Design a protein around this nucleic acid. Structure first.
Lengths: 409, 166, 90, 38, 138, 461, 374
RNA sequence: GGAAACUCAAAGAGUGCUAUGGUAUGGUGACGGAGUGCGCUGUGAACAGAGAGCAUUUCCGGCAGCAGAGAUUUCAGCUGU
């Protein structure tokens, strides 16, 4: 009761956009019209970098939205403070880079290069060349566990402890190259998507996948998980988006026959669903729900209110988008594409009320230092990763549920 | 129990109220000996309840001589009678922490319900409030304490030596 | 439940209302018919929903054919919102 | 009763000091021991 | 707890200044314990309507305990007047984290439902309010 | 179309003036804070590891000890830091435990000073000056009880004939002494237990059950007129001083070395005896112990209660002391030292934070009752962190990985080897009694709490 | 953090204030973010008593809006629930926190006392006694707090015993400012005037004198003289007998000017025996002051006291029946003064003539008075 | 190696700042204030008190009429609902 009474103390309110008419649909609202309708600070957050010569840019944001990490396909990796004008690493690693991520900070980032994964400090000096992690295409950091997770063209999934420096786990996927990869933020299990149409949920303890789901036909192009750890959207190459229950492993929605295969999905902190099919980005609101009236449609046939039309859409007319990522605590969607970066003002798309002692967008240098030491001190072991997080206080599922009083012994 | 504390100083008299006792048995330990150097933990021990300032350098010199030769002056009588509760004289006296074992008898001669303590616990409480000084007083005195100290030291010395300017 | 002026004054204080502030910033302002009718458009009658460009100048979802003077006014407002009206003409 | 009303009351300046307001403006904004380096 | 050192009374009850002993020897030449000044003002329809000036005079005149007794007398008088398959979960044992769960049910509980109802709420700063955190950790 | 985005505004989150701290907005959503079991498991594990590295319990020995091993100790129950100790060569000493130095020493007797306690002597001709004199009295095997006064510098009220204000005299030796907590009375055990008061030079009453001698004595702390004593016929006798008579006794298997009464429960006491464990007894029903504290490996020499009544300290003949939570029955903590031999006396200081042990090499040593606990005053952030960590270790107490760390100590080689052969002996007798119970017909299930009483006068119905 | 504690202490009153349907959730979130701003500014570093004062003003404004909205929505004047005292309790606690943090601005202490007194029946006079006790403990030398404390407990509660105790304790602490002496003689005259007027009133419906005021007058002269001779000539007595007699003369001038002010504001107490109560100050000033006020310098002061003793019955209106009764007393006074004085003889004659002419058909009896004093 | 600075970062040391919840406001009409009784302080008595405890239906936090109080708002008692 007292923890739930804090919603009075919550400072800000979430954003939205609402149609106020029946002629005014919401998917036909233009980004210039948003930038005219919203304030100058948000209009200046909606950046656009036109970086033409190196390849399509994989985008990545820090877990508070302060730093941006872009990687060109050719060699151009830049870590920057996108909201000031401060870049702190611009390094041209002339072999084909694939992906990057921050580790626990803007102070270290890991890039997946031609073969080996490299780890660079704040100003861009190379700290580590990982001799394992042979061909990564997907990196993701587990921040409460301090684990860099790596998958790619080899059929192997590798968990590497960044703090000690020690390769925690090597797991045979046994299903060829890893086509997609996402992390459950709830329980830190890794959902990998293979060329079978199979998602598999993995933990660094079990050398077998915790679960194998048959998501799609063909391969699995992209996976996204809600931050509540309840829903998972997977796009296959069979032009099929599929919304999955994670906890009970039901299949909630099956949007089949997309016009072209969805190359990316992302889920915001307030539960929007951003699908990207090449030039097009399309966002649905309240699509991750149980009822059949929340199945994401593309039009409402005759004005049906029980059809989830897109919340907003945008067309990147020149190019094909490389990846999607919502900016964490702001109302923006950063999409990285062939000619650089574009933020989109998506009004419903961010937690307005962060917690400032989990992760703070205004944090200072001293706060970064002490929070780094404290989270390093309370780093969770990699063995505590289970399918449910609340299963490390309990008793065994063997060892009879009644305690025994030695008369019965 | 060291309930109240009397700190004499050139600007006047201060009565502090002891909030938390320091350790008696662990009083020589390292953490107990340097908690009186840290101000953030000394303010957990000592709270200021009263400060009667002097009427000037004349009453300052009078009270400096009375404190020097171990007598209770009239301003001392006033501030102690204002601040200390009317305890019993036969059962559980109120405990005042002084720094002068021959000023104690002059305090019990005037207030029989007051037992006075100046042993090592009262000594390091007293030197804690001496070490911090102007920070404990929360801004309530006129005059910088070291400037009044210079004036009172020169006045006390010339009085004690009978310095004549003729 | 009526309003009140004293109640709304100290409510604007308590809730931190800059509404009169923006009103004063917008207000203060630094103070210190036609020569022809053709009689053919009135009896023409256009379709609307046949091409996607004219599909936007409906005011309902049941409009399918409109009168010519109405249709001319719809695309006059549409021209005015493509090219906004400058100040040199009026 | 009017004489009790007009008896001189005890005067302070304390609650007037509570209700006091101010007329204040705002006015604008080597070592002894170091030998001289020749 | 002894009686507090107040500034409304005398913390010694014997005259402590020359002023105090002078005032008390004059006041014992002519005492002012105000039993006379209690019995003088403990005396005072048309008493309600017509006496609207002597009532205000006695209201201004009466002292502290006199006014307390007058309020009690009016209260007592008025109170006397009135009243083929899509999900394949592996069920292998997690031998690496069966050290993060206890071996049996500990002593004071009788079953794991009771014991996990003990463990079900985190006492952390991050998960409770500040007041609830303090109540849980004292 | 109405439209609204997140307006963060930077005045609420980074402060205007530089002198003040930044705002910390909170949001108590479990979505925002995901790993709520693992995170406080690791905080409880780091708290147990921090306790095992902060466990520095030895404060210091006081003085230079004695010459011949400390066999009697008495705290005074009204002052925090004063302690009287007596050795085998007849010397007694009064100690200021703040400065760790003796107020005075006294060649008290010629034999062993076999008991000493402290008094506020209610004379009815003189008036006791308890703000400058402390009083300790002490009995020995040279048939004397002597009462001494000590000059004490604790108040500075005054400015004196310190030692031996009187000398009580018995015909046989004495073995224990304890003073009543009012009314000028004490009691001395020995060849027979006598009651005395500080005015009369002879015993007021002889309160002996039979003609069997008395080895130890303790008065109750509340309900102050109830005495208890240990006789060398393995007997524990209760006396009442209203009836001026013994009350009830029990005979155990082996000999009770000491008693201490619970200062918070007034009818419970703990006995410390020669089979290597302590027994928590209720005065209203002595037919069963209501706890057994088992972890010692040789004869338990002395026991004492915390003044909070919540834990006991227990020093034994294996050269180690042990602290026990009162509801458990196994040791919460063991203190040992290569220099400490045969701890014969243990007291629990009135702070409930330090533990005084008198060994028999001569030394009296201070210890912390909680080893990881420091004695400075604490700001609210560190006090909140410490009690958060205590609650967290409490609710994760039985996880195997933190239980194996909190359970861990370094015990000496002799105590460890005696412990493991004690384990294999007890496991062997449990195996053999299980076999014998499988065969034979009527083998009664005797409780552990009853397994050590051979009998009881004044039977219970 | 403790701002978190205080902010979530603020939540039950707005639970109740949303349940009673006067505020809505979107406006109570606005008052919580303003209150968050204020609580953070209060218990962070670099804090100010103006932060405390602005928080008190904001809480009083939301209290007034709450009362207005209650009268407009529920049409009651209090909901007799939590949300009509919690906010005044909050203001009282902000005051207590501020006076514990900065106990040095008497403006804030007096705003605390004013709000606590004006809270009315809901406060407690022992709660006002507690903050009077700690304020007088911190500032014993500041004398207007003693006057305000005794004025509250006499001019509101009429507690003569406690008021006498307050004045005696204040005069114990600073027996050096004459203002506390004058307010004590004022209180004693007011108390004896109320005593004799309640005697007159009980007579008209159906021993203890100003000698209290004279005794405190006597110790006022003695201790004010002692403290001025100790204040000036401060460190030592290194001064020859010229400077010692110069000092003693000046303390006589100081003390006698204060007694001149004493009689000047003593005359208006005319309901007791004002003649006796002024004549006793006259006879207390008439005696010797160890440095020859009469037989040497301060002869102007001797002439002033002689003029006062002459007109001490002639303190009258233009109806001069007392003058026609005892102007021969003034003539004998002028004769006895001019029998000894040299220039004070002419000064006292011209001054008594000018005073009687200024103060005094009706001009024909005044022509008799002019012929008398010509 | 050198130079520049209202340049950008990474760290170290010292100093400053009431840096003060030993278990957080006087009060979820479950409440507060007033008074009484018990309790407490300096075996019975009177006296002097403290604000530091505990009840309970003794009244008030209902309405006017009316005069009074301070700076048009709040404050203070009589006759009945």
């Amino acid at each position: 009761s007292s923890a739930a009474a804090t919603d009075y103390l919550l400072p800000e309110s979430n954003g939205y956009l609402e149609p106020e008419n029946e002629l005014e649909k919401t998917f036909k609202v233009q980004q210039s019209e948003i930038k005219s309708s919203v304030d100058v600070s948000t209009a200046n957050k909606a950046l656009d970098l036109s970086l033409k010569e190196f390849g399509p840019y994989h985008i990545k944001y820090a877990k508070n939205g302060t730093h941006l990490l872009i990687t060109g396909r050719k060699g151009h990796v830049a870590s920057m403070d996108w909201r000031k004008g401060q870049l702190r690493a611009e390094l041209f690693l002339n072999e084909t880079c694939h992906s990057a991520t921050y580790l626990q900070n803007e102070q270290y980032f890991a890039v997946a290069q031609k073969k080996y994964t490299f780890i660079y400090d704040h100003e861009g000096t190379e700290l580590h060349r990982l001799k394992q992690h042979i061909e990564a295409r997907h990196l993701d950091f587990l921040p409460y566990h301090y684990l860099l997770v790596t998958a790619g063209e080899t059929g192997w999934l590798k968990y590497h402890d960044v703090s000690t420096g020690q390769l925690v786990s090597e797991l045979r996927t046994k299903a060829g190259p890893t086509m997609a990869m996402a992390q459950n933020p709830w329980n830190a299990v890794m959902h990998l998507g293979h060329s079978n149409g199979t998602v598999s949920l993995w933990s660094p303890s079990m050398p077998e996948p915790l679960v194998k789901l048959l998501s799609a036909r063909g391969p699995v192009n992209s996976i996204a998980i809600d931050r509540s750890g309840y829903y998972m959207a997977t796009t296959g190459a069979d032009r099929s988006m599929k919304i999955w229950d994670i906890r009970n492993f039901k299949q909630l929605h099956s949007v089949e026959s997309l016009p072209t295969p969805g190359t990316n999905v992302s889920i915001s902190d307030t539960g929007l669903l951003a699908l990207s099919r090449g030039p097009h980005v399309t966002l649905w609101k309240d699509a991750l729900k149980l009822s059949g009236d929340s199945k994401p449609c593309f039009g409402s046939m005759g004005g049906n209110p029980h059809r989830n039309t897109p919340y907003m859409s945008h067309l990147f007319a020149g190019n094909k988008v490389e990846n999607l990522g919502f900016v964490p605590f702001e109302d923006l969607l950063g999409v990285g594409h062939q000619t650089g970066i574009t933020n989109l003002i998506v009004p419903g798309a961010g937690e307005a009320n962060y917690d400032a002692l989990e992760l703070n967008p205004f944090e200072t240098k001293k706060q970064r230092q002490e929070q780094e030491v404290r989270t390093l001190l309370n780093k969770l072991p990699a063995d505590t990763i289970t399918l449910d997080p609340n299963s490390i206080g309990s008793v065994d599922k063997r060892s009879s549920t009644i305690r025994l009083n030695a008369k019965d012994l | 129990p060291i309930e109240y504390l009397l700190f004499e100083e050139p600007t006047g008299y201060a009565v502090f109220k002891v909030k938390l006792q320091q350790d008696d048995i662990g009083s020589r330990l390292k953490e107990v000996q340097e908690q009186i150097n840290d101000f953030g933990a000394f303010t957990k021990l000592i709270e200021l309840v009263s400060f009667a300032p002097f009427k000037g350098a004349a009453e300052a010199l009078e009270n400096a001589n009375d404190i020097s030769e171990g007598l209770v002056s009239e301003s001392l009588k006033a501030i102690l009678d204002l601040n200390l509760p009317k305890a019993s004289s036969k059962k559980k006296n109120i405990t005042l922490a002084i720094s002068d074992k021959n000023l104690g008898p002059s305090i019990k001669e005037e207030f029989p319900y007051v037992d006075c303590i100046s042993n090592e616990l009262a000594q390091d409480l007293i030197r804690g409030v001496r070490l911090h000084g102007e920070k404990l007083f929360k801004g309530l005195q006129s005059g910088d304490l070291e400037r009044a100290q210079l004036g009172l030291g020169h006045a006390y010395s010339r009085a004690k030596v009978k310095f004549s300017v003729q | 439940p009526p309003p009140d002026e004293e109640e709304q004054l100290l409510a604007k204080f308590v809730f931190g209302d800059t509404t009169d502030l923006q009103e004063n910033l917008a207000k203060f302002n630094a103070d210190f018919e036609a020569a022809w009718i053709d009689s053919d458009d009135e009896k023409i009658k256009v379709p609307i929903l046949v091409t996607n460009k004219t599909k936007k100048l409906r005011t309902s979802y049941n409009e399918s054919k409109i009168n010519g003077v109405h249709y001319i006014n719809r695309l006059r407002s549409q021209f005015e919102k493509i090219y906004p009206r400058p100040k040199w003409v009026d | 009763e009017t004489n009790l009303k007009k008896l001189p009351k005890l005067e302070t300046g304390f609650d007037a000091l509570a209700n006091k307001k101010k007329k204040k403006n705002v006015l604008p904004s080597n070592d002894w021991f170091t030998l001289p380096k020749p | 707890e002894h009686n507090h050192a107040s500034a409304f009374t005398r913390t010694q009850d014997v005259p402590q200044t020359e002023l105090q002993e002078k005032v008390d020897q004059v006041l014992q030449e002519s005492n002012l314990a105000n039993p006379e000044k209690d019995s003088k003002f403990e005396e005072l329809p048309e008493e309600m309507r017509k006496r609207t000036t002597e009532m205000r005079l006695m209201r201004e005149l009466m002292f502290r305990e006199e006014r307390k007794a007058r309020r009690l007398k009016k209260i007592k008088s008025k109170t006397y007047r009135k009243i083929l398959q899509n999900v394949i979960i592996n069920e292998k044992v997690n031998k690496k984290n069966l050290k993060y769960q206890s071996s049996a049910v500990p002593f004071p509980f009788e079953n794991r439902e009771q014991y996990e109802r003990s463990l079900r709420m985190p006492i952390g700063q991050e998960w409770t309010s500040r007041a609830s955190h303090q109540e849980l950790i004292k | 179309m109405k439209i609204k985005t997140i307006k963060r505004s930077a005045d609420d989150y980074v402060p205007v003036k530089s002198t003040q701290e930044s705002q910390m907005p909170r949001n108590l959503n479990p979505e925002l804070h995901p790993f709520e079991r693992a995170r406080e498991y690791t905080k409880a594990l780091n708290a147990t590891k921090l306790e095992r590295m902060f466990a520095k319990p030895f404060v210091g020995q006081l003085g230079y000890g004695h010459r011949d091993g400390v066999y009697a100790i008495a705290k005074n129950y009204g002052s925090l830091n004063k302690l009287a100790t007596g050795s085998a060569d007849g010397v007694i000493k009064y100690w200021n435990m703040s400065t760790r130095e003796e107020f005075v020493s006294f060649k008290a007797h010629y034999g062993l000073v076999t008991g000493l306690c402290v008094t506020q002597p209610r004379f009815h001709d003189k008036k006791p000056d308890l703000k400058s004199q402390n009083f300790m009295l002490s009995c020995s095997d040279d048939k004397t009880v002597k009462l001494w006064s000590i000059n004490v510098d604790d108040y500075s009220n005054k400015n004196n004939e310190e030692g031996l204000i009187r000398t009580f005299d018995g015909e046989s030796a004495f073995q224990g002494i304890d003073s009543h907590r009012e009314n000028s009375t004490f009691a001395t055990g020995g060849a027979k237990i006598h009651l005395w008061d500080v005015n009369r030079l002879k015993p007021v009453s002889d309160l002996s059950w039979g003609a069997d001698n008395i080895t130890s004595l303790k008065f109750n702390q509340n309900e102050t007129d109830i005495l208890a004593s240990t006789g060398s016929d393995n007997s524990i006798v209760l006396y009442d001083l209203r009836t001026n008579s013994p009350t009830q006794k029990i005979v155990q298997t082996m000999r009770t070395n000491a008693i201490c009464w619970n200062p918070m429960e007034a009818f419970n006491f703990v006995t410390a005896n020669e089979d290597h464990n302590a027994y928590y007894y209720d005065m209203r029903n002595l037919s069963r112990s209501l706890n057994v504290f088992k972890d010692h490996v040789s004869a338990v020499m002395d026991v004492d209660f915390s003044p909070t009544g919540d834990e006991i300290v227990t020093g034994s003949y294996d050269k180690s002391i042990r602290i026990y939570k009162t509801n458990h029955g196994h040791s919460r903590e063991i203190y040992h030292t290569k220099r400490m031999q045969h701890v014969f006396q243990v007291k629990y200081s009135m702070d409930s934070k330090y533990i005084i042990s008198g060994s028999d090499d001569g030394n009296v040593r201070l210890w912390r009752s909680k080893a990881w606990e420091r004695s400075n005053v604490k700001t609210t952030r560190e006090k909140n962190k410490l009690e958060y960590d205590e609650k967290l270790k409490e609710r994760f107490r039985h996880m195997p990985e933190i239980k194996r760390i909190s359970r861990h100590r370094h015990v000496p080689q002799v105590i460890k080897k005696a412990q493991e052969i004690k384990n294999i002996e007890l496991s062997s007798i449990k195996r053999r009694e299980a076999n014998e119970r499988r065969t034979r017909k009527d083998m009664p299930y005797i409780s552990e709490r009853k397994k050590q009483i051979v009998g009881t006068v004044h039977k219970y119905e | 953090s403790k701002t978190r504690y205080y902010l979530e202490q603020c939540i039950p009153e707005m639970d109740d204030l949303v349940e009673k349907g006067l505020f809505t959730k979107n406006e109570v979130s606005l008052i919580m973010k303003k209150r968050t701003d204020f609580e953070h500014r209060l218990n962070s570093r670099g804090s100010s008593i103006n932060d405390y004062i602005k928080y008190i003003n904001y809480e009083s404004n939301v209290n007034k809006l709450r009362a207005k909205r209650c009268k407009r929505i529920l049409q009651v004047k209090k909901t007799n629930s939590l949300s009509d005292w919690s906010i005044q309790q909050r203001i009282g606690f902000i005051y207590q926190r501020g006076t514990n943090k900065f106990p040095q601005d008497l403006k804030f202490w007096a705003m605390y006392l004013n709000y606590m007194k004006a809270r009315g029946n809901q406060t407690s006079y022992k709660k006002i006694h507690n903050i009077y006790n700690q304020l007088l403990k911190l500032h014993p030398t500041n004398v207007d707090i003693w006057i305000s404390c005794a004025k509250y407990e006499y001019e509101v509660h009429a507690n003569f015993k406690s008021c006498r105790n307050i004045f005696q304790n204040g005069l114990r602490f600073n027996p050096d400012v004459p203002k506390l002496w004058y307010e004590y003689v004022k209180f004693e005259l007011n108390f004896i005037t109320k005593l004799i007027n309640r005697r007159k009133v009980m007579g008209l419906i159906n021993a203890l004198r100003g000698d209290i005021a004279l005794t405190i007058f006597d110790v006022c002269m003695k201790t004010l003289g002692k403290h001025y001779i100790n204040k000036h000539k401060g460190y030592y007595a290194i001064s020859d007998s010229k400077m010692n007699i110069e000092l003693n003369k000046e303390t006589l001038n100081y003390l006698f000017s204060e007694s001149l002010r004493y009689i000047k504001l003593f005359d208006e107490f005319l309901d007791l025996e004002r003649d006796y109560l002024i004549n006793h100050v006259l006879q207390f000033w008439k005696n010797d002051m160890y440095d020859l006020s009469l037989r040497k310098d301060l002869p102007e002061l001797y002439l002033k006291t002689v003029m006062i003793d002459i007109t001490l019955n002639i303190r009258y209106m233009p109806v001069e029946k007392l003058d026609i009764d005892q102007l021969q007393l003034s003539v004998k006074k002028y004769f006895a003064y001019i029998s000894k004085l040299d220039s004070a003889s002419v000064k006292s004659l011209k001054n008594e003539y000018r005073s009687y002419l200024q103060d005094n058909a009706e001009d024909d009896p005044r022509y008799k008075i002019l012929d008398l004093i010509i």
